[PDB]
Symmetry: C3
Subunit: 143 residues, 3 copies
Amino acid sequence: PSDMPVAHVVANPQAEGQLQWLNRRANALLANGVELRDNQLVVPSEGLYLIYSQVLFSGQGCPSTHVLLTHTISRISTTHNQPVNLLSAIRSPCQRANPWYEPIYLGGVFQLEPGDRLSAEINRPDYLDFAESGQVYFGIIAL
Amino acid sequence: PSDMPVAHVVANPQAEGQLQWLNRRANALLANGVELRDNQLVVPSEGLYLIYSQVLFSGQGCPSTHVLLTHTISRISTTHNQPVNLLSAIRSPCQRETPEGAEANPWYEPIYLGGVFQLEPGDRLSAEINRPDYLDFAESGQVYFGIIAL
Amino acid sequence: PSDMPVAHVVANPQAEGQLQWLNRRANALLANGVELRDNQLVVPSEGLYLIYSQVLFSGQGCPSTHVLLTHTISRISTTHNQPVNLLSAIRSPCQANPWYEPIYLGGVFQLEPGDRLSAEINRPDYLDFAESGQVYFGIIAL
């Protein structure tokens, strides 16, 4: 089999209104050294990791105020407490009561070091939608 | 060199209003045990697989009934038949139907799904949409589904 | 420490109005044979590669006319001069007002030595690389 560090976590459906990564669920992974601490994935050993995450935002009708939805995956190494954005995207659901949906997918390969902490964050958890499985996830795999 | 289960299938360009995955063509893959059956990719052996898919939807203007577009990759395992959604996303191309006496402009909405999953031999993977009437595969590279054992 | 051909390049925030890929930067990669030439990633050896790219488009206001935003990864082989689109997507932007439209592309492909991969857009005037992590292009031999 494989002993490569791997994780695939999803939004916890019991933490409504928040983004709390969860691995205790069917079709989720957290193994071979990867840990979930303080809502962040912690890298076991150095190497090339494919990192990815998807969030789905939804709302009914368009707010009177212009809203921007952001999703970013950031890296925090032990050699610097300053978070660095590896992947980031923005979306504007409204131009100015029909429900809107906006998915954001981020993904790339990065050289990581042992102890590195990866965070997958959003700016509007009040719009996050994990009403159904597979809509919000965050993962990594050492290649 | 190879040996690892792999597939990269694409929408049949000749299909009409249906998402038919195909592999026998340039820049598409289906090898090392992966099979294409009943429009599903069948896993030959257990392991961690990267699974991904993209669909592109397009329409001419905004209709009366509000449209939600969905794309979902699901897994069927023999020992727990109940199909389960591994990855799924939804998009809304319009906020209101094209005004009366207004110009009906075409819209395009891509959806990309991708993740790493532990699969077992015999597992069947589906990548399906709810609105094949808006699926757009007019040009190459717009609709694809693939997996690779890592 | 790895041995597999790999690259992760990003938009040069200093080349305005243009999409110029750059590897010389923290959290970017270009090793084990992969090279950047004429703004394209050049494949070192035959094999399966995961290839992907993301672009972000933005405008302070919605276009006065109907516009289509495109992002495509194409392949140019040494045996086929005409480019082939491996991955492609299209987005229709809107017709207190700034808009953003991300596009992500990715898939696994059998490539050959010398193959050239290009990740391009149709509207560099709308490309947004104001912040890190928004525009990238990468490949890795699996």
